[PDB]
Each structure stands twice: as C-alpha cells, then as structure tokens.
C-alpha cells in the first residue's frame, strides 16, 4: 500500500547474488516491530553458520535503511523439509510417503493427484493412486508436495 517492501527485498538480493549465492528469499511478519525472515543457500556447499555471518552483513544494511529507534528485526533460515519436490534422486529418498502433484503435459481443468510413492526406476516413478498400482514420468511432473501420515 504505502511502503517499498519489495524494493528492500531487491536491495538485499543484489549484494547476496554478487557474493556468489544461488538462493536468497524473504518472508515479512506483521508486528509492532516489523520482522523479516531470510532463506539463503549456495551451489558451493556453504554451512548455515557462515550463512549467518553473511546474514550479519544483511542486518547491517537493514539497520541503516531504516534508522528510527528500534523498528526492525531479522531471523535466519534454510529451505527445510517444507519445500516442493523435483529431483530424480529425491523422489527415491522419499519412497513410502504420500505425495500430491500436478502434470506438465496437461492444461487447466486437469486433476490434482494424490497417492503413495513405492519405488523410482529410471524416470518412471511407481505409485498407488486411488487404490490402483500406477506410474508417473518424473519429467512430466510440474509440481509435487509431500503429505504426512494420519495420526
């Protein structure tokens, strides 16, 4: 509405991309004191403690952008377990799980699918869907997300 919150994300992204990182992302948290949480990662294998030394420089540019009393807070994270799934090796890590997905060869008014992953041979994931033994081509998946067991 009134504040350049996306321009602050741009101004934090450009130094971190010029530092040789591959993932840099933000969430905003509404509060009396505004609170950012940063997500960061590399292609080159950099540890989360050293990512928090880079994030200490992110706190230093944030601290001079808005300097009035204490109006800002910053938390630091990795992309976690909570991310969608794409890689051929990772579909194989997560056999024995229920997954929900959408397909690339199809147009809107296609189904959203849900079912159990059993084995991954080549590009052909092997699955149970609506109680039937079925298959998916992993290059035909456009998005997938993991589902936990009922308890």
Automatic annotation (TrEMBL):
GO cellular component, as recorded = cytosol
For the Ribosome maturation factor RimP C-terminal domain, which residue ranges apply?
Answer: 85-150
Q: What is its main location?
A: cytoplasm
The alphabetized UniProt keywords are: Cytoplasm, Ribosome biogenesis
Judging by the UniProt lineage, the source's domain of life is Bacteria
**Entry's InterPro entries?**
Ribosome_maturation_RimP (IPR003728), RimP_C (IPR028998), RimP_C_sf (IPR036847), RimP_N (IPR028989), RimP_N_sf (IPR035956)
> Ribosome maturation factor RimP N-terminal domain: which residues?
11-82
Where in the cell? Cytoplasm
List the Pfam families. DUF150_C (PF17384), RimP_N (PF02576)
Tell me, which GO biological process terms does this entry list?
Answer: ribosomal small subunit assembly; translation
Keyword Ribosomal protein assigned to the entry: answer is: no
Q: Which family does it belong to?
A: Belongs to the RimP family.
Q: What is this protein called?
A: Ribosome maturation factor RimP
**What is the protein's species of origin?**
Escherichia coli
Q: What is the lineage of its organism?
A: Bacteria, Pseudomonadati, Pseudomonadota, Gammaproteobacteria, Enterobacterales
């Amino acid at each position: 509405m009134s504040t350049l919150e996306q321009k602050l994300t741009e101004m934090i992204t450009a130094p971190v991309e010029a530092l040789g990182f591959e993932l840099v992302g933000i969430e905003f948290i509404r509060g009396r004191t505004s609170t950012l949480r940063i997500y960061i990662d590399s292609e080159d294998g950099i540890n989360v403690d050293d990512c928090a030394d880079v994030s200490h420089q992110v706190s230093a540019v944030l601290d001079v952008e808005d300097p009035i009393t204490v109006a800002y807070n910053l938390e630091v994270s990795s992309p976690g377990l909570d991310r969608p799934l794409f890689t051929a090796e990772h579909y194989a890590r997560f056999v024995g799980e229920e997954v929900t997905l959408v397909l690339r060869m199809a147009v809107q008014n296609r189904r959203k699918w849900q079912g159990v992953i059993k084995a991954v041979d080549g590009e052909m994931i092997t699955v149970t869907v609506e109680g039937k033994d079925e298959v998916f081509a992993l290059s035909n998946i456009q998005k997938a997300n993991l589902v936990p067991h009922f308890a």
